[PDB]
Amino acid sequence: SQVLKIRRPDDWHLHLRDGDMLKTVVPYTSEIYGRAIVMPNLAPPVTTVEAAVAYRQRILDAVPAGHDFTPLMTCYLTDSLDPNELERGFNEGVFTAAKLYPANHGVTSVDAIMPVLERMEKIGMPLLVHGEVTHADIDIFDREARFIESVMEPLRQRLTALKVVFEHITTKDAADYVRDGNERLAATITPQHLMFNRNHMLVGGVRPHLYCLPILKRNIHQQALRELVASGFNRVFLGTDSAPHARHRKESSCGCAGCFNAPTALGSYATVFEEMNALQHFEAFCSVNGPQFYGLPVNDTFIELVREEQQVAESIALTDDTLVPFLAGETVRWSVK
Amino acid sequence: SQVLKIRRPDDWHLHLRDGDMLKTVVPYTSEIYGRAIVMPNLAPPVTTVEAAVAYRQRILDAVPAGHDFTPLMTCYLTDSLDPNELERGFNEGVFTAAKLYPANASTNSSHGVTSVDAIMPVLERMEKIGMPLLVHGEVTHADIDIFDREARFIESVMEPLRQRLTALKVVFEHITTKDAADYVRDGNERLAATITPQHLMFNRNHMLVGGVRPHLYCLPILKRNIHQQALRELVASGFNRVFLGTDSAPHARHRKESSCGCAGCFNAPTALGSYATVFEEMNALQHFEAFCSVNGPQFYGLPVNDTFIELVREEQQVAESIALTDDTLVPFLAGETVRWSVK
Ligand SMILES: NC(=O)N[C@@H](CC(=O)O)C(=O)O
Ligand SMILES: O=C1C[C@@H](C(=O)O)NC(=O)N1
Ligand SMILES: [Zn+2]
Ligand SMILES: [Zn+2]
Ligand SMILES: [Zn+2]
Ligand SMILES: [Zn+2]
């Protein structure tokens, strides 16, 4: 019965993969979102303007007629990346941002890429950060918190004009850090980190389809993220981190990290905001806060969500194997009209 | 290559399942261990003397010719269990101990315990007759974080229970935390513990970094490294009320590598060499025999075995999988090179 009309959203953190998987997954995004930040962690990664241009066209080829979807491309930062290559892609309108993955082709130190980061700061290119330390001796649940202290804060103190998105935050540590930051710091939050905590992944069985990075944390962290979005804080915004893997790559002796949440993310977010008595802040999170941070216009079309329960498919067909969507088989309280 | 000769060990915490799975898994235990505590969590659970007798015989049927193996049976504690039935099974030598799984108010009374307070008549009977209680010490309330469930049990259940029933003998099964290590270390002659090979060898990082590894997923869940280190130090200390209990808990590969993987490591094939590796790494091999072969018997009031087995420090590869009638089992350390093996 209840209908909610919002400005068309964007997805500020998306994995589209390549090849046949790209063809399968793109429509779940392109049917809903005006734009998406397309992450560069292909094999091999997108580290040049030329690769980014070709990847963008493969994406556009897979977008159904009648969907007005624009992929915003990113550069995968590497220790040896030429700042001129990054800048050129920015100037050509190819790279919207650059993405920093901690090694384990990722970045091994901030110090190794200082000239690149200094160029980004100068030109006004946002830096998107997967904020975890990776030393083998650090417990996995501690890696996000540890990153703040040892990498993020020294970085932000060194390059004070650099615009940073703390991607897919999962902790009270990160939530407080972002809440207390300045207008050059923002964050994205996935639906899974709002909806669940580590118990949902581990109690009653191990659930690889809830296994993603940064790892689901303790309930107190989930609650902190929920309070953050619900507060109306305007430097957090929608980034699904939809990260699809074939079923038997997920369900194996060593399951891949990532939730394929593009089919269900928007309605899942609506449920969270509704539960937090915060639907007044829902549009901004989905459709305004991101554009404002990135300095891009808001979308000029509108969509409607309706509060009628849809069951999520058990699986989605691939050329080989299937794809198991996030919330497969379950019910979602809101759907797109 | 180096040889380690020990009195034949026993496994004080074992799942043997039933039917065809039992037939496949029993030999991995019976070739090595003289005795094992056979857990009662069948479907339906072993809650009567008659079921335990029949289950014991199915286990004996599946022991290969010449293995000297004796299953020690257990009763699954439930709300509906008659204390007279438990006593009779103990008196008759059928039940060696009884096993308490986590309480849950929604459990069927035929299948488990609603709250510990509700089964005090059976626990009082065990205390009275000197029957040991084996405890899977977790609280499973939905609002308790899974990594906290063992510690919460100590505070909410274990300590009050032992204060209530001061003569009750208890094994804190498969301990996984420094909380439990300290608790058991600081306890009296009526409190003991078992520790699995996976909880000594690994911590939660091994299960979650670089991938999710369902073959390391078991209950109680692997904890952070500080807890692993506490467990290692406890066994390394020579503390004589900790002993070998594998919690070998086999599930078919398709039930492990699924959208909702079952909890349990099939470690019977590789457990003994794994414990040898841990004790060696802790420079504590002088305590290894006692852990495997002496401490358990002493706590249960049973004789130590009078035959010997030898482990050799020679590298061997663990099978990738072990055929079942249908599907396959993936052993603990599948495909790995291990340092110690049985001669
Ligand atoms: N988050 C995930 O668990 N997976 C992402 C990587 C990422 O966002 O780090 C992927 O590309 O598979
Ligand atoms: O408590 C338990 C039960 C056991 C089993 O599978 O029987 N598996 C476990 O991982 N621990
Ligand atoms: Zn990431
Ligand atoms: Zn991502
Ligand atoms: Zn148990
Ligand atoms: Zn067990």
XYZ file of C-alpha atoms and ligand atoms in Angstrom:
707
model
C 0.000 0.000 0.000
C 2.526 2.623 1.188
C 4.390 4.311 -1.697
C 7.646 6.243 -1.406
C 8.766 8.496 -4.307
C 12.476 9.387 -4.419
C 14.837 11.048 -6.811
C 16.490 8.314 -8.885
C 19.460 6.954 -6.945
C 23.074 6.265 -7.814
C 25.416 3.547 -6.589
C 28.719 5.021 -5.368
C 30.484 1.644 -5.017
C 29.831 -1.173 -7.547
C 31.609 -4.225 -8.956
C 30.441 -5.134 -12.475
C 33.105 -7.737 -13.330
C 33.700 -8.420 -17.019
C 32.767 -10.768 -19.847
C 29.623 -12.856 -19.437
C 29.238 -11.992 -15.729
C 29.152 -8.278 -16.664
C 26.389 -8.984 -19.196
C 24.359 -10.775 -16.520
C 24.745 -8.278 -13.663
C 24.738 -4.842 -15.363
C 20.930 -4.770 -15.898
C 20.201 -5.101 -12.148
C 22.019 -1.791 -11.712
C 21.153 -0.024 -14.972
C 17.406 -0.489 -14.521
C 17.418 1.557 -11.270
C 20.526 3.723 -10.804
C 21.357 6.788 -12.895
C 25.071 6.336 -12.372
C 27.454 4.000 -10.598
C 31.075 4.197 -9.454
C 32.548 1.187 -11.247
C 35.425 -0.296 -9.278
C 38.645 -1.230 -11.110
C 39.674 -4.551 -9.536
C 39.423 -6.606 -12.761
C 42.069 -9.241 -13.549
C 44.263 -7.516 -14.594
C 43.182 -4.258 -12.938
C 42.118 -1.092 -14.754
C 45.256 1.046 -14.375
C 45.295 3.018 -17.655
C 42.981 5.369 -19.513
C 42.927 3.009 -22.491
C 41.737 0.048 -20.389
C 39.132 2.244 -18.679
C 37.754 3.460 -22.039
C 37.434 -0.132 -23.343
C 35.884 -1.330 -20.102
C 33.399 1.521 -20.167
C 32.305 0.512 -23.689
C 31.887 -3.162 -22.684
C 29.660 -1.928 -19.867
C 27.656 0.317 -22.221
C 27.243 -2.589 -24.689
C 25.595 -4.626 -21.915
C 23.134 -1.878 -20.869
C 19.640 -2.620 -22.165
C 18.071 -0.084 -24.543
C 16.027 2.477 -22.623
C 18.091 2.427 -19.423
C 19.764 5.823 -18.904
C 22.771 4.521 -17.015
C 26.235 6.114 -16.914
C 29.202 4.184 -15.507
C 31.700 6.404 -13.705
C 35.072 4.745 -14.076
C 37.886 4.495 -11.580
C 41.622 3.875 -11.658
C 43.201 1.082 -9.635
C 46.104 2.697 -7.760
C 49.374 0.827 -7.871
C 52.762 1.641 -6.324
C 54.217 2.483 -9.754
C 51.238 4.286 -11.364
C 52.283 7.418 -13.311
C 50.536 10.561 -11.954
C 50.309 11.870 -15.562
C 48.284 8.778 -16.581
C 45.840 9.328 -13.714
C 45.545 13.059 -14.378
C 45.086 12.502 -18.142
C 42.188 10.097 -17.516
C 40.689 12.668 -15.139
C 41.031 15.463 -17.669
C 39.479 13.314 -20.427
C 36.427 12.601 -18.243
C 37.412 8.917 -18.131
C 38.377 8.591 -14.433
C 35.921 9.943 -11.904
C 38.080 8.728 -8.977
C 40.961 6.453 -7.995
C 40.674 3.459 -5.684
C 43.171 2.436 -3.014
C 43.251 -1.263 -2.192
C 45.699 -2.329 0.485
C 48.041 -4.992 -0.930
C 46.413 -8.392 -0.156
C 48.521 -5.684 -7.220
C 47.242 -3.206 -4.565
C 49.123 -0.415 -2.834
C 51.873 -1.462 -0.409
C 52.294 1.938 1.221
C 50.872 5.420 1.059
C 54.521 6.592 0.971
C 55.146 4.700 -2.305
C 52.260 6.565 -4.014
C 52.657 10.052 -2.484
C 53.238 11.792 -5.822
C 50.021 10.251 -7.200
C 48.036 11.302 -4.133
C 49.527 14.815 -4.259
C 48.423 15.076 -7.913
C 44.900 13.924 -6.943
C 44.820 16.569 -4.201
C 45.904 19.271 -6.641
C 43.390 18.357 -9.336
C 40.413 17.704 -7.046
C 40.120 13.978 -7.742
C 38.516 12.008 -4.925
C 40.355 9.055 -3.374
C 38.231 6.016 -2.589
C 39.715 3.870 0.180
C 39.279 0.217 1.124
C 40.401 0.937 4.663
C 41.972 -2.185 6.160
C 45.482 -3.105 7.220
C 46.586 -6.554 6.115
C 49.480 -7.655 8.330
C 49.032 -11.373 9.045
C 49.280 -10.811 12.815
C 46.302 -8.443 12.954
C 42.977 -10.087 13.732
C 40.556 -9.695 10.805
C 37.924 -7.915 12.943
C 40.523 -5.294 13.921
C 41.795 -4.375 10.463
C 39.422 -1.463 9.788
C 39.976 0.211 13.190
C 43.703 -0.228 12.854
C 43.670 1.395 9.414
C 42.131 4.600 10.774
C 44.913 5.138 13.292
C 47.900 4.000 11.242
C 47.011 5.047 7.662
C 43.871 7.152 7.229
C 44.523 9.862 9.838
C 48.214 10.399 8.984
C 47.209 10.521 5.297
C 44.451 13.117 5.870
C 46.803 15.202 8.056
C 49.437 15.116 5.313
C 47.145 15.948 2.373
C 44.593 18.266 3.959
C 42.869 19.235 0.652
C 42.408 15.623 -0.473
C 38.828 14.445 -0.759
C 38.450 10.932 0.662
C 35.607 8.420 0.645
C 36.017 5.798 3.397
C 34.350 2.972 1.435
C 31.972 0.378 2.967
C 32.580 1.238 6.614
C 31.724 -1.490 9.059
C 32.663 -0.198 12.524
C 31.650 2.300 15.198
C 35.317 3.354 14.941
C 34.839 4.391 11.304
C 31.338 5.756 11.865
C 32.545 8.099 14.674
C 35.642 9.008 12.599
C 33.515 10.026 9.623
C 30.865 11.758 11.794
C 33.566 13.892 13.388
C 35.437 14.608 10.133
C 35.399 17.634 7.818
C 33.652 18.285 4.471
C 36.459 16.455 2.630
C 35.671 13.117 4.269
C 32.697 10.895 3.361
C 31.691 7.239 3.526
C 29.599 4.586 1.825
C 27.710 1.858 3.598
C 26.395 -1.384 2.084
C 23.009 -2.893 2.803
C 24.526 -5.995 4.439
C 26.489 -4.001 7.043
C 23.253 -2.205 8.020
C 21.029 -5.269 8.013
C 23.271 -7.871 9.652
C 26.202 -8.490 12.006
C 28.628 -11.375 12.214
C 26.097 -13.564 14.046
C 23.972 -13.732 10.897
C 26.989 -15.168 9.015
C 28.074 -17.706 11.705
C 25.216 -18.756 13.994
C 23.325 -21.864 12.886
C 25.777 -22.515 10.051
C 28.397 -20.668 8.064
C 26.841 -18.469 5.389
C 29.325 -17.622 2.624
C 26.819 -15.416 0.836
C 27.149 -13.021 3.809
C 30.956 -13.294 3.685
C 32.420 -10.097 2.361
C 35.182 -7.606 3.103
C 35.453 -5.723 5.340
C 34.095 -8.586 7.416
C 30.774 -8.233 9.233
C 31.460 -7.083 12.773
C 29.878 -7.241 16.218
C 26.294 -5.982 16.719
C 27.462 -2.789 18.458
C 29.169 -1.823 15.179
C 26.075 -2.608 13.138
C 24.086 -0.392 15.507
C 26.550 2.477 15.085
C 26.219 2.349 11.293
C 22.426 2.263 11.544
C 22.453 5.274 13.851
C 24.793 7.128 11.527
C 22.573 6.809 8.419
C 19.448 7.486 10.505
C 20.880 10.700 11.950
C 20.668 12.475 8.601
C 24.439 12.978 8.487
C 24.926 14.138 4.916
C 28.406 12.722 4.139
C 27.311 9.101 4.103
C 25.755 7.725 0.936
C 24.633 4.624 -0.922
C 27.350 2.280 -2.105
C 26.162 -1.297 -2.447
C 29.558 -2.964 -2.959
C 27.583 -5.448 -5.033
C 30.359 -7.986 -5.623
C 29.111 -11.030 -7.525
C 30.763 -14.450 -7.644
C 29.496 -17.645 -9.218
C 27.722 -19.904 -6.662
C 30.427 -22.550 -6.413
C 33.123 -19.893 -6.013
C 31.163 -18.800 -2.941
C 30.227 -22.303 -1.774
C 33.632 -24.015 -1.736
C 36.482 -24.927 0.583
C 37.691 -21.310 0.265
C 34.761 -19.095 -0.538
C 35.258 -15.722 -2.257
C 34.330 -12.495 -0.478
C 31.412 -10.403 -1.752
C 27.605 -10.072 -1.656
C 25.634 -9.808 -4.939
C 23.200 -7.280 -3.576
C 22.345 -5.142 -6.649
C 18.950 -6.851 -7.098
C 17.854 -6.148 -3.512
C 19.947 -3.284 -2.118
C 17.579 -0.363 -2.663
C 14.567 -1.986 -0.941
C 16.859 -3.305 1.776
C 18.067 0.210 2.495
C 14.441 1.412 2.590
C 13.623 -1.197 5.273
C 16.572 -0.023 7.400
C 15.624 3.645 7.247
C 11.996 2.758 7.955
C 13.039 0.638 10.947
C 15.129 3.548 12.223
C 12.161 5.916 11.814
C 14.284 7.867 9.350
C 12.604 7.712 5.918
C 12.910 11.541 5.787
C 16.679 11.015 5.262
C 16.399 8.130 2.805
C 16.297 10.100 -0.470
C 19.373 12.123 0.535
C 21.382 8.991 1.287
C 20.345 7.388 -2.028
C 20.218 10.353 -4.378
C 21.727 13.623 -3.042
C 24.610 13.139 -0.583
C 26.859 11.347 -3.100
C 26.369 13.864 -5.914
C 27.074 16.680 -3.436
C 30.326 15.103 -2.266
C 31.450 14.316 -5.808
C 30.328 17.717 -7.095
C 28.027 16.172 -9.699
C 24.425 17.145 -10.401
C 21.571 15.219 -8.820
C 19.468 13.017 -11.130
C 16.462 14.673 -12.676
C 14.195 11.639 -12.791
C 12.185 9.924 -10.027
C 11.323 6.355 -9.049
C 8.793 4.887 -6.587
C 9.209 2.190 -3.965
C 6.129 0.440 -2.672
C 5.768 -1.542 0.557
C 4.689 -4.837 -0.912
C 6.678 -7.958 -0.081
C 8.604 -9.541 -2.973
C 10.390 -12.923 -2.667
C 13.976 -12.825 -3.941
C 14.956 -15.414 -6.589
C 16.819 -18.481 -5.274
C 19.315 -18.036 -8.117
C 20.146 -16.183 -11.281
C 21.311 -18.027 -14.389
C 24.861 -17.660 -15.720
C 26.379 -19.239 -18.777
C 27.968 -21.757 -16.361
C 26.869 -22.194 -12.728
C 24.435 -19.744 -11.161
C 24.597 -16.550 -9.218
C 23.041 -16.533 -5.713
C 21.609 -13.152 -4.878
C 21.857 -11.572 -1.458
C 18.667 -12.523 0.420
C 18.060 -15.419 -2.021
C 14.710 -17.047 -1.297
C 13.767 -14.466 1.315
C 11.335 -11.582 1.378
C 12.114 -7.920 0.956
C 9.526 -5.500 2.375
C 9.974 -2.796 -0.245
C 10.155 -3.103 -4.006
C 10.593 -0.713 -6.953
C 7.299 0.128 -8.649
C 63.718 -39.846 11.655
C 62.528 -39.109 15.192
C 60.142 -41.524 16.918
C 57.632 -40.740 19.644
C 56.283 -43.771 21.488
C 53.272 -43.361 23.742
C 50.804 -45.538 25.586
C 47.862 -46.075 23.254
C 45.716 -42.934 23.396
C 41.966 -42.482 23.839
C 39.644 -39.881 22.380
C 37.500 -38.312 25.141
C 35.211 -36.477 22.670
C 34.078 -38.098 19.429
C 31.188 -38.022 16.923
C 30.787 -41.274 15.024
C 27.396 -40.578 13.400
C 25.379 -43.625 12.293
C 24.575 -45.834 9.278
C 26.987 -45.683 6.321
C 28.856 -42.611 7.655
C 29.642 -44.518 10.874
C 30.976 -47.427 8.818
C 33.316 -45.063 6.956
C 34.583 -43.053 9.943
C 34.934 -45.659 12.746
C 38.165 -47.182 11.413
C 40.008 -43.836 11.583
C 39.390 -43.919 15.339
C 39.579 -47.654 16.095
C 42.938 -48.200 14.442
C 44.566 -45.744 16.889
C 42.555 -45.094 20.070
C 41.768 -47.807 22.670
C 38.582 -46.046 23.799
C 36.473 -43.086 22.838
C 33.673 -41.088 24.403
C 30.944 -41.445 21.803
C 28.675 -38.403 21.765
C 24.903 -38.868 21.685
C 23.706 -36.258 19.210
C 22.188 -38.635 16.692
C 18.873 -37.835 14.927
C 17.005 -38.702 17.110
C 19.390 -38.392 20.061
C 20.531 -41.251 22.305
C 18.424 -40.664 25.445
C 17.669 -44.226 26.633
C 19.654 -47.224 27.758
C 18.196 -49.338 24.911
C 19.234 -46.883 22.170
C 22.760 -46.666 23.603
C 23.085 -50.451 23.690
C 21.953 -50.746 20.066
C 24.177 -47.848 18.970
C 27.175 -49.417 20.765
C 26.612 -52.615 18.825
C 26.379 -50.820 15.445
C 29.717 -49.153 16.325
C 31.252 -52.519 17.263
C 29.942 -54.072 13.992
C 31.897 -51.444 12.025
C 35.233 -51.921 13.822
C 37.757 -53.660 11.503
C 38.943 -57.119 12.523
C 41.748 -56.912 15.066
C 41.280 -53.296 16.288
C 41.002 -53.254 20.085
C 38.516 -50.430 20.358
C 35.854 -49.854 22.997
C 33.176 -47.235 22.593
C 32.200 -45.437 25.819
C 28.572 -44.340 25.437
C 26.854 -41.175 26.575
C 23.313 -40.038 27.305
C 22.016 -36.796 25.734
C 20.489 -34.773 28.585
C 16.948 -33.586 27.907
C 14.081 -32.031 29.889
C 12.045 -35.269 29.630
C 14.868 -37.656 30.596
C 13.977 -39.770 33.632
C 16.821 -39.616 36.201
C 16.065 -43.323 36.910
C 16.855 -44.147 33.279
C 20.205 -42.289 33.420
C 21.121 -43.966 36.748
C 20.231 -47.394 35.417
C 22.353 -46.865 32.304
C 25.280 -45.711 34.486
C 24.876 -48.594 36.952
C 24.829 -51.109 34.064
C 27.978 -49.763 32.436
C 26.061 -48.519 29.368
C 26.494 -44.778 30.007
C 29.994 -43.646 30.925
C 28.863 -40.005 31.112
C 26.064 -37.661 30.132
C 26.336 -34.728 27.742
C 24.741 -31.309 28.258
C 24.240 -29.255 25.080
C 23.329 -25.556 25.156
C 19.882 -24.763 26.627
C 17.093 -23.295 24.513
C 13.589 -22.529 25.770
C 12.124 -23.547 22.415
C 13.778 -27.003 22.300
C 11.464 -30.036 22.158
C 11.686 -31.780 25.543
C 12.549 -35.065 23.704
C 15.609 -33.455 22.043
C 17.209 -31.181 24.607
C 17.171 -28.877 27.632
C 15.103 -25.695 28.039
C 17.153 -24.363 30.936
C 19.673 -25.944 33.302
C 17.420 -25.171 36.238
C 14.770 -27.420 34.651
C 16.999 -30.510 34.733
C 18.262 -30.223 38.296
C 16.771 -33.561 39.336
C 18.898 -35.362 36.710
C 22.042 -33.322 37.570
C 21.547 -34.002 41.293
C 21.285 -37.707 40.463
C 24.554 -37.586 38.493
C 26.201 -35.828 41.444
C 24.858 -38.437 43.851
C 26.113 -41.459 41.863
C 29.432 -39.976 40.675
C 28.559 -39.837 36.985
C 30.572 -37.233 35.074
C 28.783 -34.436 33.204
C 30.270 -33.410 29.862
C 29.368 -29.835 28.978
C 29.251 -28.008 25.653
C 29.542 -24.694 27.442
C 27.878 -22.029 25.341
C 24.827 -19.853 25.912
C 22.930 -19.501 22.629
C 20.676 -16.472 23.236
C 20.155 -14.607 19.976
C 21.442 -11.336 21.462
C 24.783 -12.812 22.491
C 27.639 -12.421 20.029
C 28.852 -15.816 18.906
C 32.428 -15.160 20.052
C 31.124 -14.307 23.547
C 28.990 -17.435 24.055
C 31.626 -19.551 25.850
C 32.647 -16.845 28.316
C 28.991 -16.054 29.053
C 28.382 -19.725 29.838
C 31.142 -19.728 32.494
C 29.504 -16.849 34.365
C 25.833 -17.706 33.838
C 25.843 -21.505 34.033
C 29.109 -23.272 34.872
C 30.071 -21.431 38.047
C 26.567 -21.371 39.551
C 26.034 -25.059 38.694
C 29.307 -26.113 40.355
C 28.486 -23.930 43.373
C 25.038 -25.583 43.563
C 26.300 -29.166 43.125
C 29.681 -29.200 44.875
C 30.392 -32.925 44.246
C 29.512 -32.907 40.548
C 32.361 -33.898 38.199
C 32.448 -31.878 35.004
C 34.414 -31.921 31.768
C 34.374 -28.545 30.032
C 34.438 -29.928 26.518
C 36.442 -28.407 23.671
C 37.481 -25.220 25.396
C 38.284 -22.352 23.063
C 39.032 -19.285 25.179
C 41.515 -17.937 27.642
C 38.463 -17.438 29.875
C 37.884 -21.179 29.967
C 41.574 -22.066 30.149
C 41.994 -19.876 33.263
C 38.743 -21.158 34.775
C 39.757 -24.785 34.364
C 43.353 -24.086 35.467
C 41.975 -22.479 38.628
C 39.432 -25.199 39.382
C 39.454 -28.202 41.649
C 39.940 -31.916 41.103
C 36.312 -32.226 39.900
C 36.792 -29.945 36.864
C 38.602 -30.978 33.676
C 38.595 -30.030 29.967
C 39.211 -31.381 26.481
C 40.846 -29.479 23.644
C 40.586 -30.208 19.901
C 43.537 -30.056 17.478
C 41.946 -27.207 15.451
C 41.622 -24.911 18.462
C 45.341 -25.382 19.251
C 46.560 -25.055 15.664
C 44.388 -22.211 14.378
C 42.489 -19.083 15.266
C 39.617 -17.305 13.540
C 41.991 -15.605 11.054
C 42.694 -18.994 9.509
C 38.955 -19.485 8.906
C 38.314 -15.975 7.468
C 41.394 -14.326 5.997
C 41.874 -14.785 2.252
C 38.566 -16.658 1.980
C 35.932 -18.322 4.104
C 36.951 -21.863 5.032
C 33.970 -23.981 6.078
C 36.207 -26.967 6.951
C 37.533 -24.885 9.852
C 34.004 -23.865 10.838
C 33.022 -25.722 14.039
C 31.440 -24.950 17.407
C 32.527 -23.435 19.628
C 33.761 -21.024 16.953
C 37.515 -20.417 16.549
C 38.458 -17.372 18.592
C 41.049 -14.625 18.268
C 44.757 -15.483 18.525
C 45.070 -14.498 22.199
C 42.684 -17.357 23.029
C 44.546 -19.866 20.847
C 47.751 -18.940 22.657
C 46.107 -19.504 26.059
C 45.025 -22.992 25.004
C 48.501 -23.832 23.757
C 50.098 -22.606 26.968
C 47.623 -24.615 29.062
C 48.438 -27.964 27.398
C 52.126 -27.024 27.315
C 52.117 -26.434 31.057
C 51.680 -30.080 32.044
C 48.378 -29.158 33.705
C 46.926 -32.638 34.239
C 43.169 -32.063 33.971
C 43.241 -31.235 30.275
C 43.149 -34.191 27.848
C 42.673 -35.313 24.280
C 39.202 -34.888 22.831
C 39.167 -34.468 19.068
C 35.549 -33.401 18.568
C 35.889 -35.162 15.234
C 32.592 -34.196 13.713
C 32.214 -35.390 10.107
C 29.840 -33.920 7.520
C 29.654 -34.762 3.824
C 31.451 -32.294 1.564
C 28.196 -30.960 0.069
C 26.893 -30.181 3.568
C 30.121 -28.316 4.414
C 30.572 -26.432 1.121
C 27.066 -25.027 0.868
C 25.024 -21.859 1.455
C 24.776 -22.858 5.095
C 27.752 -24.999 6.034
C 27.496 -27.411 8.926
C 29.760 -27.004 11.916
C 32.450 -29.617 12.506
C 35.960 -30.749 11.548
C 36.599 -34.381 10.475
C 39.900 -34.610 12.331
C 40.089 -38.262 13.494
C 42.462 -39.119 10.617
C 45.007 -36.361 11.489
C 44.357 -35.327 15.103
C 47.075 -37.298 16.890
C 49.943 -36.055 14.699
C 48.493 -32.557 14.964
C 48.666 -32.619 18.735
C 52.247 -33.964 18.504
C 53.112 -30.958 16.256
C 51.608 -28.481 18.770
C 53.388 -30.047 21.776
C 56.679 -30.044 19.854
C 56.249 -26.397 18.843
C 55.548 -25.555 22.490
C 58.747 -27.412 23.569
C 56.454 -29.489 25.732
C 56.722 -33.028 24.323
C 57.305 -34.373 27.859
C 53.589 -33.650 28.514
C 52.268 -35.111 25.280
C 51.752 -38.745 26.437
C 49.846 -37.622 29.583
C 47.537 -35.464 27.485
C 46.846 -38.315 25.033
C 46.870 -41.343 27.331
C 46.900 -40.649 31.091
C 44.974 -37.516 32.169
C 41.618 -38.660 30.759
C 41.773 -42.112 32.337
C 42.741 -40.557 35.703
C 39.780 -38.132 35.605
C 37.278 -40.819 34.565
C 38.700 -43.373 37.004
C 39.622 -45.837 34.248
C 42.879 -47.752 33.651
C 45.591 -46.362 31.403
C 46.121 -48.488 28.264
C 48.986 -51.000 28.447
C 49.864 -51.174 24.758
C 51.865 -48.628 22.803
C 51.840 -46.817 19.512
C 54.598 -44.905 17.709
C 54.500 -41.621 15.844
C 57.308 -40.953 13.406
C 58.525 -37.503 12.424
C 58.406 -38.157 8.709
C 56.454 -36.057 6.227
C 53.252 -37.421 4.737
C 50.425 -35.973 2.607
C 46.882 -36.009 3.945
C 44.231 -37.352 1.537
C 42.263 -34.643 -0.311
C 39.023 -36.504 0.452
C 37.719 -39.811 1.717
C 34.938 -41.601 -0.178
C 31.522 -42.101 1.394
C 28.764 -44.286 -0.043
C 27.374 -41.009 -1.361
C 29.535 -37.904 -1.642
C 32.855 -37.530 0.082
C 34.446 -36.398 3.347
C 37.133 -33.750 3.488
C 39.542 -34.516 6.311
C 41.100 -31.921 8.626
C 44.307 -30.696 6.882
C 43.191 -32.256 3.551
C 45.961 -32.192 0.953
C 48.544 -30.850 3.412
C 51.978 -32.234 4.291
C 51.975 -33.077 8.008
C 55.081 -33.434 10.226
C 54.129 -36.417 12.420
C 52.276 -39.570 11.453
C 51.520 -42.920 13.031
C 54.008 -45.684 12.243
N 33.988 -6.492 -0.651
C 34.129 -7.743 -1.051
O 33.987 -8.617 -0.219
N 34.454 -8.057 -2.315
C 34.850 -7.110 -3.358
C 36.145 -6.375 -2.950
C 36.050 -5.159 -2.014
O 35.106 -4.262 -1.966
O 37.030 -5.099 -1.233
C 35.077 -7.878 -4.658
O 35.503 -7.250 -5.667
O 34.840 -9.135 -4.715
O 28.975 -28.943 19.127
C 29.342 -29.307 17.998
C 28.538 -30.399 17.316
C 29.451 -31.094 16.300
C 28.662 -31.996 15.413
O 28.616 -31.741 14.185
O 28.089 -32.970 15.924
N 30.153 -30.118 15.487
C 30.687 -29.048 16.055
O 31.347 -28.292 15.352
N 30.462 -28.847 17.357
Zn 36.556 -2.897 -0.653
Zn 34.211 -3.047 -3.436
Zn 30.256 -29.559 21.450
Zn 31.171 -32.588 19.975
